[model samples]
Target chain A: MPTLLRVYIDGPHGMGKTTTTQLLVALGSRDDIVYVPEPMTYWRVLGASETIANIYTTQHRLDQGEISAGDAAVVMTSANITMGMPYAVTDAVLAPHIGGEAGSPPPALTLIFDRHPIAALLCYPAARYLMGSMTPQAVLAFVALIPPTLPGTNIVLGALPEDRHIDRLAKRLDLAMLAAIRRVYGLLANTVRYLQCGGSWREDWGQLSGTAVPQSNAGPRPHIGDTLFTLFRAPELLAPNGDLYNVFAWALDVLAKRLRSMHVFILDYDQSPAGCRDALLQLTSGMVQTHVTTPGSIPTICDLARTFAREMGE
Target chain B: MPTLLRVYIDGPHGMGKTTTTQLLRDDIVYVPEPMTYWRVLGASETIANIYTTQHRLDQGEISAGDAAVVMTSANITMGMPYAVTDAVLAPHIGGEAGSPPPALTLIFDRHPIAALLCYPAARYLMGSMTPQAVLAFVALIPPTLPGTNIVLGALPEDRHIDRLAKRQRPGERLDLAMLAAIRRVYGLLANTVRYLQCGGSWREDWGQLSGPRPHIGDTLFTLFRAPELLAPNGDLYNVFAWALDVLAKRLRSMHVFILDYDQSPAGCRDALLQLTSGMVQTHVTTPGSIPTICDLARTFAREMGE
Candidate 1:
């Protein structure tokens, strides 16, 4: 069976993920691999009216108290639907062609995606919720819409110190948003680990912060406080009596299920762009690849990537 | 403080809901379903396309995966109007009121769940959509507001089939299986609401599905008990179970009233109006909110109605 390797390079903006992904894709044979960049055109014009600007303006208005949280959440949720469309459509179209996971060795086609759907649907919404520009209910609403994770879903995230990250952000900025996004991404990583360890917040709350690193365990289970599960405990998300809201808690369960099987890798962005690209390349050695259900699927998937790049990419 | 009564008339299609709702006039704004939006604006012949896709899948002409892509895309279009309406109206809505001769009455042709939950669940039952996809739609269900009263219909299966045939919608067919599926889903929907209002949790009281709990036998959880939705061990898959959790959450707060569709349209309308006295009402966020909400409903009808 023909195979495909799908890599999603995602992290907070201004982290050099896009540039490094471009470099990585540039080094590979064009016919054998394709790079799908962020849907800037879709965000700017096609899907909705300048969604990025709308998001930033909405956030600014919320911060300035010019708009209420409910107003902001409505705008954010609507904009998110538009923002995630390209990714969602791409995933939906490609879903049928995908089969079981294949052992790693570069596949017949290598499709490098700039960001996964969760970036718009989960990460950004969660970050916005943290920034007080979105409601917990709206955030969970977006979480519930997340598509099921497919096989060979290898997502590469970035790790950079706040100081250096802020310096990188000097090229482009929103300090509060940057902080919230960074924290959300950090929590995402831990949430994955927590799920991978078979940790349930409901059942393992006490063991979450344990000092002992048991010999049989791969690593100490992530503390509940450090994972995305912590965010749902905000007063707004709790019942009046302080019990966890069942609605919001179910969304957390959805998050865990979605992220549990994903293969996550972290790239150090503290290095130069070239060094970063090389590090990402090395990380690809451990990434999973998957078999295409049909021989025609490779070119079909390739056409999708190339066309998306042509139309949506800057 | 001006009050608003929001009544959503929803149930299995061809159950005289739209016809009955059309008779509801008297200090009310009837926000009809976005039929034009579905037929032309959102996508060309979406209803026809949806039914056609399912028909083809049933006839063994298209794969489940192919049907799924169509179903998922169609649902996105189906849901847009509802989502946008809810979002626009959400800010103006305040806390629930005890009873009403509300200052402004908003009688909606159908709630968001008609697109997001009932249809999706029915399609899932028909094998055109995956349980995961259905949950994905459910997760996007607009937050239930205070005074969200929904009137669902009830009719004998044979009588419903007869009514359904007489009012076959544009690009519709007489499919008994789909009729049964939709009927079962709406029934479960009512039961689910009652169960949640009774302080029942499907996750905690799962055993109640077999044992006796109020409204347990006909609850939404029973819909998920289909063999296709369960794991090999007869356990509900986590994803689908999560979907049920979402169903429970979204429907829990709704005020459900069962309208007997066996009556004439005029009788149905009168009975529905009588039920209005018992419906929950809520204060508008501002005195100005009534007009704004009314304008939204009116404009929605003008722009989206067929």
Candidate 2:
């Protein structure tokens, strides 16, 4: 089979992934990856109900026709709930709609995967909420428990170049943005729920992904739940800067500890094709396969870097 | 004349120019330019009475070649007393040596003409004897200013990185590490002198620049002396993050303000080339004397958003 290029971008709200991608395509700096806006974005722009159900449906269809088994392919993913939770959970209801003939991922890739939890966790609570503004100290303490610097995290930071970085932050902790804020209030109650819920942000990020399952494909992005989103702009917003960078790096260290305890390979590279390949190879030359990622061929890793850089920073 | 690459680096105290050079050399990351140590540094190290200058000079050449062109080609009167004062006031008793190359010299290659000013005028009005604690600041400042993505005034905030970086700071600042308290005094004084006198940093800077026969050489380095040396290392420390890159982007602005005033082509290139050389060239073409300054800085500027 030929090479398949796949890219995944995850980060806090406001960091500049979208802008980076836009510039890359506009500038034609690196001449590889082509960006395909997630289909639901158009529906969302039209003010329709793009939701989890539609996301999975579109994702499945896209996966089916997404390039060929041999040709290179790149996909951009948001950390929004539809893709993270819905897609992961969808595997239970539908047979995994697709898995490439692509092999396992490598060790280096895992470091970023496991580490980024803290970065997400740091930007806001997984149960996010806010009443009055809090302190950086508090946020630091709360997220300090998780690991960080997932490769995704770096990619996010990388996207937010200090000079003109963008931050597309999630809008939870405030219930005013989402249309479905009312529905979630009914399901959960208490200090935590009250503090975390940003109810009205429904239909916030849905259209940016793919379609849902169960054949309700032709309709609006009906938000199954709520998630708030707010992109950081120049006049009123900015990225987290080196503080976030430091936090992410620390998170990666935390991840290394978790893997050692589980007797798994610490985050190392499996299929990276760039400069890190040597570092990855030297690191994993003697490791076992219990956590053996599908040994991603370099093409898989290159696909992500190029696609992401092209899509984000051109 | 050979293509002269004049590199001027300056900033606040505590930046890591020397250490960075050593690291760059160790890594062999770049080797095109020569590392030119300053005169007072030669004075401090071996206590040489004359300029035992030049990158090629040996440790023992205390009394070497003619006093014309030292380590670097530029001439500097700051180290020796100015000719007006050093010789004119002698009143026929004796005429001291004239200024050497760095004091008032030529520029012909990529060279970082690092300096160590040994006297602090800031303390002269204090009436107390000059101690050794002041010279370390700008001595440390010069090295940290170049090859950086941004001005970030200070760097490697992590303690390990900080300690490692601080080691490359001037010998004067190393007084912070000395076991003896008095030993710390003179070295630091040297740095204080450097901080006060090096570049265009004198408190009397405006007055001095305005004086007749004022430091015409000082004009080229005016931007480096700004109080906001806090380069604000952003999300990425890439070349775009650097402020000098802006100067590079608008080389004409620098040319208009500083270069156009200069009588020499060498001086003009020396002033702006520091910003133009070796930047990521996607948005702009590489800088050359012949091209428009904008063309040099933004060869790829349009393409960056293309």
Candidate 3:
């Protein structure tokens, strides 16, 4: 079977994972690449109905077809449901799913997990401890039981954002649980590939330029009809030494080359150091009262579209 | 240069790791399994092996030299990633640290059978592969740098093993009955010996049919019941008790470690223990415990006169 380069943007809720995912989808990496949206998002979208019934259906259908983006989309959406359940359900399901018991085939598709099983397995339990079920001790205890490695995935963890680096969703998050969970991820050197983010991209990663975004009063993402997610152009917003374009550029480079080979490249960063959301927030933080609502303008979007098309066509 | 098998000595606590390690020719550079740094906290035996070796090698404690021997067990080896092994050995073997790369030899004491029984995660044959693939993976390690030799010193034999002696005739399959018998034979040997030495009760059908070969049955009965029949000239006094003996006499490394996945934990331990006086109560021995290390310490103590 032709292997799919599964790149997962795995992390807690508030981090810049969503923005990074959108950026990767937008930046034309490969024509064959088909982006599968987060399985939990599917769960919430279909939470009103029989969650497991639909999941099993999606799984069975996905298993039958030729390995395609559409099929893998269904498979990940179903298979990834194991990530949410408590350890009791997760272990039972994962055991059979992963051929743990005996006489079983391995998961077929190369899948990009939004919160890969290992992260979810750790993150969800800690989240539960906060929601009034268990103490921090309980959370840490559960986390300790998980093996150093999981089957069929090259786990990439986003380095935890330092507590001082929070922007918007600071109050709502269970930072304690998140910190504890981050430490758990840190220990798994055997199975996980933890990528530290947002140093000086130009100096550390390289000065790899992307399609430039024009500095105009365009809305968040102007009606360029998709296709262009050029690098954010906000030099003043960076923390003097930080790379304004570090996360996106490094992500692309890693995804295009190294991460493309694994069963799943788990982007385990708690928050991408220089992802679009953080960059945008910083860029607009000191802007005019009018500019606060609208971060990027149509003119910039159009510029990006033109650059993307011209470059991609060549 | 001739292909060098950079030998490492490893086994459970009682296995003749030191004796077998010392048996190698004097020219071999005996690099101990750097125990001074094995992490007991928050690390399993598997990871400790990888970390200590990597740490020791990085610190220039274990420099590349002539044919070296590493004291390691299947537990230490199967626990490490192939990449880590490759990286650690790369400097000494075929890498930038050395020009054309030196020939290396690694000798493993107890085989993967010991590891498979000890680690549950490694038992998942199809699904989860933490270090399970390691045994299989290590067996057919496609030389990243080329010209690497891996040797296995395993423990097996008797008229019991002798039955498997002759080459297979064409179209004759090793029957399921034969495979079943091998398990029974291994169990009997373990059950009988442990009872005699440690004073445990007999496990199962110990006195009954030795099957098609009546003498094999008679021999086992005499050895177990008589106990004194286990003399140097006795039926069970074969050289196959040593892992190296097993490697030379019967199963090759791959067949013994990977293919033979049906070993029961107690049976595997019994077989390993039978090879040496070692009882595997711990993953590794603590500092100042090994007789060899302390003996060397005393010898150096006299030299330094401390």
Candidate 4:
């Protein structure tokens, strides 16, 4: 079986994470390349996901001081099993056998998620930092929802919050609260071995990880079966409007980690923005043949058309 | 007094033109790329700004042809030229009942250049033209606008070609060179727009040259004053900066409204602050909040319904 290349795209709540997810989902037309948006399904997030509705209701009751920690824990635990299981099962086992016959060589799978456990790991911390006190039940619920370190599942997170606003949906946090959450993410990146992939300096694949659980190596030794993340890294370019200036910097962050890769290609679609073009220019500054692009002008219905074609050997 | 410096940052759609525009000034009158407006209403804001004669036709909002122009220090990158409209002077122009109906409300989206780039591919998809034939026909038109400052930032053709290889879509990849050529053609058509208004210097700033740094900074700006106005040889740059500062200061209570083609101002917050200098509140039009384009034709009657 081929190990899957699992990518986790992490960023704060509003920094166009949903937009990024939507765009990436637009690209997911391949059997080998699967894109699971955030924990909640699309319809669920559209204010219709019963699973999400229940969790939020429970969270609401807990916040209003109507429910006990034990009650919140059961609700959160049930929510995790209902929401997180699909993804865990999808990436852990089902991914590697994507296209080819059952007895045939396992096909290399590309699994992309808009947000992942690396992000989930911080949810508890963010809640604690933002609320000043988080429930123990919330911690248990989060730990249960946390994904395992599957072999060869490369987890790349959007480390920084693009938007200054911290909390989404419920009570909103200001710039200071948002900054506090970011600090927690940075600290987590240092402690977690997987989150440490793209650290202060870029390291090659060999330097990234090898002692990862043997389940990763169980698959056919596929090339480039690693996870790489895009993050904000630089002299911290400022947004003209306080942090809005820094918002665009996320692409620059993405470029820093992207530069560590052997080849970087921007999968441009019709809606691809000039900002990405500008970022490409900056990312490839002084470097030759670094970042590549698919012309957005061309019409391709699926974002994963390229990956799909590659797997099919077309 | 110096003329208004209208900076039109035109690039292929999806390039951060809108974001860049949003970043430059918070108090922007939202406009879409030019072509989207043209398709909706038959012309663009830049053209409308130049055709200030239209505003004259609406004598006291009574001009039959119904165009209005308000010359103000407001900035623009996309969307209709609201600064030149009655909305800036008399914000109630559209709201008043029984008032003479305006000829047409301008809409902003992608300009003609972007339409041309995508249109050819679309036409080919629809079997309207062969790829080679379209390329040949497109070649006949000169790509760059004559004597106009249209700065184009294009991805190299190799970039596009490399993308197709990764994407592995069925069709032949539109070569980046061809893409670059198409952008040049768009730039040509874009520059074809003539805004011969008095009192301003229009400069083009390409994003790539700045190297990841932002255009808006504390560094003092030096503007060359028009010698035609009979100003001194070493004319006033400080005066220009002071004028902008004063304009921003004056508009403290003003609201910076942001809109996209569909009237959504999703990421316009930053630009709203920069233009207004954190002095003004910003409002973006979502699909729900967008008012009807009052006099739109029956084709858009459905959109105007709610």
Candidate 5:
């Protein structure tokens, strides 16, 4: 049996969440593998995938009229899924993040809408706190349409009056940003949908799934099986138009938005250090928790690497 | 035997009568028709050919200048033999007249070149007045070189100037024009000498005179025996880029210049009346002279309806 590389849910965002998670986690593709979904899916996010969440989040941030000089990193990483993103598009979205003429190239897989940083970064300024009941009737009206024919779907309205404009401006900004996110997601989704265009990306193996998830002994596996993605390291991002943070955010956002419906936004790190192990003051000082991301923020990668290194030693 | 087309010695100023006359007289493709060397091959100023006996010839016309433009018409229908006339070795002449801008949606052949007035009319202005002197040189020069041997052909002193910039100063406009003419001629001439580019606008059946001297009727008859040029009629003359005039002049000038000799230039005119597809025009008052050049011009054209 082969594995399920990608999956989509058709019910409302929350409902899609349960179905996607259940199927992904239980459904096996190969003789020894099962799909595991994202935390928000398990969390209260339900069907509002990472894309919906991030769009809601980023829109809220940008709506506050922007306080900072746009130098913040909004982290959102989906565990795995590999799909081609268009090149020109992601740069268009990230262009506003930096000032005039600045942009973040999505490298390739550009169609993946990274609904995280942009939605969050955009919304953070205006939306200091999380969204609460302001327009329940309106929210209900739009939310109602999500479940039936169009699961995991959203609509973004641009209409607003004068005084009403400022009042709803932040949400609208988030709405605008979310719409852009949906389009991008749609493109990637469309790409996946068309990979076979009624045919299959992998037609050789029909329906298959494995109950046992094989734990990687080393480096964190890609979110999508057989998927490859290049991390910017840091300098890859530094050269103005080449910001590593945004590039990572782009991939993360794309994965989060696109993959959030099914998988976890896990930053699989390691138990060891990021890169540096400078024992400069070994004689005088005690060792520090010199971790790249916080232990919880990045655990699986380091653990996997450490486990593999240890196994070799064994 | 078919008669030959006669060159009318006169036309508009700077219209290239002499330049075109001698050129038409000499067959750039001289091998196509056998030559007769007994025919005098002299400059218009040299008074060698009977054609140069103008009714009131000026005393100093000979001293006017070497390579001077001649003004003479067909004295005897076919005065010079094709072989005896100077052979133009065309190597370098001028740019091809046929070349047009790439944006043109269609190939600018003769009809198209003439019909579309929208293209820079200035282009037509740069047309062949010297009946294109370059082509003469390009066709004739290298053919004259002996079998399988290297030849160092000496160009006129002005022609030998190495630097492009120094070649054409304020006083050397004529020389520069000559150079322009030479280049176009050379392009074709070299193609033959090196590439063996041989063919003629005139076809095989448009035979040369062998049995008898060509008379007006005989020459006009030649027009009948004449098969259409391999190229179209409009495709003839100073074909925008590879005009026969330029090619002939280019070859002729160089070969003539190399040998320290010069010959009368060539000229030609179509007898449009003869070419009408049908007998469209009715004429009266036939001239006392051997057919008038005007009526003769008419005789070669096809009947307008036919």
Candidate 6:
């Protein structure tokens, strides 16, 4: 049966993820592989005019105390819905053509996506939550809507030193925003690890308050501090008695369930673009691939990816 | 342990749901709909704006995409209080199997589904919203809790129209089409719940959208068979099918009770009370939980109600 490999190069922005993905796809035949770039046009113009700029400006205003948190949250929440549209629509369209997972092989089609839906739906909202621009409720609202994770979903996250990462982001720099996004991505990786190790929020909530990592048989477990739950313990999200709000905690449960099955790999971004591309390619050996349900699915999926890029890409 | 009974009085507007729920007075706290938030705090005349946008779209004065953008934004405003309330109250709620008649009862004007699913789907049917946009709202529906006992109203169409015309809501117009769409969406919602409870798989039943299948005609899956939701090959697009999956997942476990709106408000209230015996009741997380939940409900009414 013809199989398909789906890879999402996702991490904090300004990482060379886009450049590396382009280089990697260049090595493959056009008919065999397609690259799904980020929907810049959608974010900047189509979804809402200058959404990225609106987001940054909203955050900046909140940070400077020029706007109230409630004011910022409204804008941030609306912007997030707009930002996630292309990703959500794409995933929904591509869902049926996908079938059960297949063993490792050279697939008939390789679709490399710039970022997954969760980056808009979960990760960035989370970062804004940490920055105090977004309410935890809004973050969880986005979390609840995340499309069910498909099989053979392989997401490659980047690894780089904070200082060097900051250096790489020379243009349009906001240190606080940079730190929050970097931290969110870091928590995302550890979250996948924590879930994969059989650590559950319900079972581990009591133990999570301390600094220790929950013990599991699958290597070193992720520290509670390092996982995504740490971000959710903000004061507004806690009850008056200091317990984490159960509703927000349920969102954590949703987050764990979504991330548990994903195949996560780390590509060190400190290297050259070609080197990053090669490292990403090397990591693909461990990724899962799935069979396309029909012979025409490959081309249909191919056209969808190309069309998304053409219509939504910069 | 103290128990909490949450009864969400929900259905299409112009059903005497709010009036009936208000007649329910006891230890219960009625959390009225967030009208102030929609009208003044969030945006001005949101209800009117919603109806007007659809009217213009219907008249070809506005494009569907334009109407979609307006409807989507309005929905966000409309849903904020519901989402915030659910989020805030989520921790205080426990499992659904608790003994009742022991503590507080919180009767809400509507569940999150009104803004998140029913209304959006209604707007989609009215051509003011896209199926994708409707599904997007569907995707954001708050996780249904254990004791999500929703009371949907049933009224004869002529009676509903008369009631609707007799008393229009703020910024509301006598739009019969919207009334039909909303009523149909709610009916489909009830059927969707029943279909899932009967072991129906949306994914399997999806192919039956254009064909005959057991109970498929009655399920919400039938709603997406519109030409807009279909591909060029005459199949329901996968994205919309996924949305149906989400719809089924969200509504499957909800406890739905039907309230006949043919009677007087007090009679409806008593019948609602009679139905409450079958509704689920949950334990409160703490001694403070009941008071906090009650205050939240009261504050929602005080701040959002007329």
| Candidates 1 and 3, the one with greater DockQ | 1
Give me the candidate number with maximum TM-score.
6
True contacts kept of each: 0.01, 0.00, 0.00, 0.00, 0.00, 0.07
Provide the global lDDT of candidate 6 against the true structure. 0.79
TM-score of 6: 0.65
Question: What tens-digit string does per-residue lDDT give for candidate 2 at B134-220?
Answer: 111121112122112211122222432344444442323322222122222223332333333334233345344335322522332
What lDDT score is found at residue B12 in candidate 4?
41
| DockQ, all candidates in order | 0.03, 0.00, 0.02, 0.01, 0.00, 0.11
Winning model by DockQ:
6
- Cα lDDT tens digits for candidate 3, A159-208: 44566325434742345545544443332321122112222323433333
- Of the candidates numbered 1 and 2, which has the greater DockQ value? 1
In the range B163-230, model 3's lDDT, one tens digit per residue, is 43342222233333333333443343333333333332222333343222223242223223222212
Clashing pairs in 6: none
Instruction: List residue ranges in candidate 2 displaced over 4 A.
Output: A1-122, A125-129, A135-225, A230-314, B1-10, B13-270, B278-306
Q: Where does model 3 sit among the CAPRI classes?
A: incorrect
Tens-digit per-residue lDDT, A82-171, candidate 5: 000110112122221211111111111101121222222212211221132111111111111111111111111111122333343333
- Relative to the true structure, candidate 5 has a C-alpha RMSD (angstroms) of 35.7
**iRMSD in angstroms, per model:** 14.5, 28.4, 23.4, 28.6, 42.2, 6.5
| lDDT agreement of model 1 with the native | 0.77
CA lDDT of each prediction against the hidden true structure: 0.77, 0.24, 0.30, 0.30, 0.21, 0.79
Candidate 1 C-alpha lDDT tens digits along A216-262: 11367777777777777666655566565444454566677779889
TM-score of chain A of each: 0.93, 0.26, 0.37, 0.44, 0.24, 0.94
Worst window of 10 by summed lDDT in candidate 2 chain B: B99-108
Writing each residue's lDDT as its tens digit, candidate 5 over B30-148 gives 11111111121111122232223221132344421111112111111111111111111111111222201111011000111111110111111223111111111111111221111
Compute each candidate's TM-score over C-alphas.
Answer: 0.55, 0.20, 0.30, 0.27, 0.16, 0.65
